[PDB]
Amino acid sequence: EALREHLGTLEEKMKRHSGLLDIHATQLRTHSEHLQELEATSNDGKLIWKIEDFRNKRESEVKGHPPCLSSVPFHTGPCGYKMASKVYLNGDGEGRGTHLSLYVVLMVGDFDALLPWPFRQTVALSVLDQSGAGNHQSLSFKPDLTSKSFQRPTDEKAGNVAVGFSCFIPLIKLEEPQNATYVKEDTMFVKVKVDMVGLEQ
Amino acid sequence: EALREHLGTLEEKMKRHSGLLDIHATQLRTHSEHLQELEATSNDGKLIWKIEDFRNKRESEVKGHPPCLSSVPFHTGPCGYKMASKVYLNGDGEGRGTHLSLYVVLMVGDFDALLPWPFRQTVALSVLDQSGAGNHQSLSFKPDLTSKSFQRPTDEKAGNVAVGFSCFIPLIKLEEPQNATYVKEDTMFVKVKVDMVGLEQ
Amino acid sequence: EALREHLGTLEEKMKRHSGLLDIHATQLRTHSEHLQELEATSNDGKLIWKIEDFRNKRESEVKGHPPCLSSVPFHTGPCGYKMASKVYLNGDGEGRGTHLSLYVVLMVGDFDALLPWPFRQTVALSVLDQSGAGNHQSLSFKPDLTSKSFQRPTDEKAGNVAVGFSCFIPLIKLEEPQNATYVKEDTMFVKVKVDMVGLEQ
């Protein structure tokens, strides 16, 4: 039992090692998510989203798994409002199954206390054209005070209620349009433009 | 002793694993510190500091532990001077115990050899008002050549001698002023403005 | 064999732990490389390279090990062309052994599909002067359509064929010139300037 006590001790020491690896693994995973956010985003209130592996992303979207895609959080100015973009890729609500839906979700920001609410900044949503013709599909809207989506975010991880266009583009047009390309080499690009500040405009 | 040699070997192998986890842990911790620095800072020579958990930070400050708070290093232009801000939260020197002290510390920069010395750039220190009135407490100074604080930093981890205002604001005013808020939802904001370059001004 | 089965199980469990540490180590190493890239670079199409431990870097360059030095990838605008700089430090091709060679390598970029090819942006390569006189050695060129170096990069990790000046500066001049310093406190600086966009220039 001299060795047995020292053997039981080794086993409990071993298990502790196994706990640290899971803890370290999660911390590595969170680090990698934070790194991508820093690399991808822009703090000018403009964000370009490179969507890749479209067909698998689209087929997987037909399945329950990955119900919608999400961007990396971006900022409308360095210490301005923080928000993210969600693309359904096989529709949501009114556009579900026949349209690609594109909306932007406001998220809890570090500097929300400084900023005024509700959010009044115009937002422009577009899908870029890889052909270089410049015939993108772009749509824009002015926030309505009435909507609870523009209220200061409190939902932390979830973010505020998604707002945007359910019927952004017909899937047939998206897949194959006459005017442009939209999906080239199984990759699509999504652009979001927000006016970062007004002053006297 | 055939097994014993192989058992002693396992134990020494086990200990090696335990060494790597401590080494990996430190490297994760340093990574997390570097990530925050990238996320929080601005390279325009302007920095906003979000101070959170004020009351605990203040009560802990009364105790020996956490004698002063520090910011993330920020840059006055992308390859300009590098510096950090230190807030005492219960005073230092002349303001100790009745005033909040706010100073900025110059730190060893990557591009110090390119830059001229001593530092001649004006610095503006302010505490923001959460109310939106705009009645912040803001003070600014022009560096004196005489001071050793504006000499090229050699102190590496410590940084150069802190310079600023000991009596930035009375604690009574800070806690509850008529003019503004200053601490809202147990969070305070500190702003530092530096002119990034002169040319012909 | 009751214990033996449970002892064999521990050993196989131990080996699994050892696999995760190597996997975690590589992921930490890749994280550190990504962190430096974020910290060092600029997305304005201008990059400053701080080369340090010059003499060891130079002596090691004489040896087979470290045949050339490389920068951190930088971008010519936020979603523009992505490229890196390579300095030979004891020459390559026409300048080998008597000149320091300085070239820039185009790399596969995230937004290559958006951008037009071939690359037509002017590039300026310079070595800074630590003295503050301003007498740097700076040279610039306009890309030739003919060259395969300005073709869209497909070489992934390697990047596109290096293009630049083999005979950027004589080593004797580099080591000790009358006009300037170039290497101060065993550190050298390399600057790359690219015009980020034209429009109507």
Residue ranges covered by each domain of chain C: 1-201
Method: X-ray
Distance, in Å, from the CA atom of B147 to the CA atom of B157, rounded to the nearest integer, reads 20
Q: Where are the beta strands (DSSP E) in B12-121?
A: 46-52, 69-70, 74-75, 82-87, 99-106
Q: Within a 10 A sphere around the Cβ of B121, how many other Cβ atoms?
A: 18
Contacts 24+ apart (CB under 8 A), A70-75: A70/A105, A71/A40, A71/A47, A71/A190, A71/A192, A72/A36, A72/A37, A72/A40, A72/A41, A72/A47, A73/A37, A73/A41, A73/A107, A74/A41, A74/A42, A74/A43, A74/A45, A74/A46, A74/A47, A74/A192, A75/A41, A75/A43, A75/A45, A75/A109
**What is the C-alpha to C-alpha distance for residues C12 and C6, in angstroms, rounded to an integer?**
10
Q: Which residue has the tokens 């500091």?
A: B49
Sign of CA dihedral A48, A52, A55, A60: negative
List, comma-separated, the residues after which chain A is broken, a break being a C to N distance over 2.5 A; otherwise answer none: none
Token duo for residue A122: 């115009």
* Resolution expressed in Å: 3.3
Contacts of B110 (CB under 8 A, 6+ apart): B79, B82, C50
CA nearest to C92, candidates C143, C37, C26, C163: C163
Task: Label residue B77 exposed, middle or buried (CB < 10 Å: 0-12, 13-18, 19+).
Answer: middle
List residues of chain A with CB under 8 Å from any CB of chain B.
10, 13-14, 17, 20-21, 24, 27-28, 31, 34-35, 38, 78-79, 110-111, 113-114, 116
Counting every residue written for chain C, the total comes to 201
* Residue B100 and residue B91 in contact, taking contact as beta carbons nearer than 8 Å: yes
d(CA A54, CA A87): 12
**What residues contact residue A30 under an 8 Å CB cut-off, 6+ apart?**
none
Partner chains of B (3+ C-beta pairs under 8 Å): A, C
Q: Each residue of B101-116: b (16+ CB within 10 Å) or e?
A: bbbbbbbbbbbbbbbe
Helix, strand or coil for residue A174? helix
The dihedral over CA atoms of B111, B112, B113, B119, expressed in degrees to the nearest 10, equals: 130
**Which chain A residue lies closest to B4 (C-alpha atoms)?**
A3
Judge contact between A194 and A121, C-beta under 8 A: yes
Partner residue facing A18 (CB), from C17, C38, C110? C17
User: Is residue B54 within 8 Å of residue B187, measured between CB atoms?
Assistant: yes
Q: How many CB atoms lie within 10 A of CB A115?
A: 16
Distance from CA of A171 to the nearest CA of B (A): 37
Q: Choosing among C10, C114, C117, which should be mutated to test the A contact, i.e. which has the most A CBs within 10 A?
A: C114
Chains that touch A (3 or more CB pairs under 8 A): B, C
Inspect the interface and report whether the beta carbons of B38 and C35 lie closer than 8 Å: yes
Measured over the CA atoms of residue C4, residue C5, residue C9 and residue C12, the dihedral's sign is positive
> Cis bond leading into C118, ω under 30°?
yes
* Among B34, B79, B114, beta carbon nearest to C35: B34
Query: Taking Cα atoms as reference points, which of C170, C166, C186 lies closest to residue C88?
Result: C166
User: Chains with 3 or more CB pairs closer than 8 angstroms to C?
Assistant: A, B
Question: How far is Cα C74 from Cα C37, in angstroms, rounded to an integer?
Answer: 8
Q: How far apart are CA A81 and CA A121, in angstroms?
A: 10
The backbone torsions φ and ψ at residue C164, rounded to the nearest 5 degrees and listed phi first, read: 165, -150
| DSSP label at residue B94 | G
Distance between CA atoms of residues A108 and A82, nearest Å: 7
Which one of B10, B38, B110 has the shortest CB-CB distance to C14? B10
Q: Are strands C137-141 and B163-170 parallel, antiparallel or unpaired?
A: unpaired
Q: Give the distance, in angstroms, between the CA of residue B160 and the centroid of all CA atoms in the same chain.
A: 13
- As a whole number of angstroms, the distance between CA A117 and CA B133 comes to 15
Q: Which CATH number fits domain B1-201: 2.60.210.10, 1.10.10.10, 3.40.50.150, 3.90.1150.10?
A: 2.60.210.10
- Distance between CA atoms of residues B113 and B136, nearest Å: 36
Q: Which residues of C touch B (CB under 8 A)?
A: 11, 14, 17-18, 21, 24-25, 28, 31-32, 35, 38-39, 42, 44, 48, 50, 128, 130, 132, 184-185, 187, 189
CA dist., res. B31 & res. C33, Å (int):
11
> In terms of CA atoms, which chain A residue is nearest residue B33?
A31
Closest Cβ–Cβ partner in B21, B28, B187 for A113? B187
